[PDB]
Amino acid sequence: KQDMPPVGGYGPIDYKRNLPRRGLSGYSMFAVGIGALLFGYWSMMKWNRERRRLQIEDFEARIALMP
Amino acid sequence: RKTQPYDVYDQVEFDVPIGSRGDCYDRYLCRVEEMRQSIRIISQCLNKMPPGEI
């Protein structure tokens, strides 16, 4: 008279299938990308242009000597 | 399993997954899907066991 099945206490667990979490898609991407990339080239032309100014100063000390 | 009997096996309910096209990726997906359907036939089996002999 000592046998298994309980009178109660059950679930069940699902048979389902779901993890579609979105996700920042669909014109949200391709907009943060271009907005990041244009910040890069804007951070250029303030350094590459400025290094071009110090470049001429480096040639300047050459030319003021050599006679 | 549901065109012939074995046992007391008629008394469970479940569906038999099918494939659409005829390749490996859609005979792969039976094996993923049958494992979800085998959980249903286990959870339906814990409720039904009669005490008795073996």
On the CB side of A12, CA atoms within 13 Å amount to 15
The answer to whether B43 contacts chain A (CB < 8 Å) is yes
Resolution of the determined structure in angstroms stands at 3.8
Size of interface A-B (CB pairs under 8 A): 20
> Any idea of the CA torsion for B31, B32, B36, B39, to the nearest 10 degrees?
50
CB B44 within 8 A of CB B13: yes
Q: Which amino acid is at A6?
A: P
User: Among the residues of B3-54, which ranges form H helices?
Assistant: 25-43
Report which DSSP code applies to A31. T
Method: cryo-EM
Alpha-carbon span A39 to A27, nearest angstrom: 19
With b for 16 or more beta-carbon neighbours within 10 A and e for fewer, the B13-30 pattern comes to eeeeeeeeeeeeeeeeee
CA distances from A24 to A21, A28, B16, B19 (A): 9, 6, 36, 32
Among B37, B35, B31, B36, which residue's Cα sits nearest to residue B14?
B37
CA distances from A8 to A15, A56, A65, B2 (A): 21, 88, 100, 29
Among B29, B36, B11, which residue's Cα sits nearest to residue A12?
B36
CA distances from A20 to A29, B2, B26 (A): 17, 34, 21
Cβ separation of A13 and B47 shorter than 8 Å?
no
* B37–chain A nearest CA distance, Å: 7
Query: Interior CA angle at B51 toward A10 and B3, to 5°?
Result: 80
CB B14 within 8 A of CB B1: no
Cβ separation of A15 and B39 shorter than 8 Å?
yes
Widest pairwise Cα distance in chain A? 117
Cβ-Cβ contacts under 8 Å, B40 against chain A: 15
Sign of CA dihedral A36, A42, A46, A48: positive
Alpha-carbon span B27 to B38, nearest angstrom: 17
Alpha-carbon span A40 to A42, nearest angstrom: 5
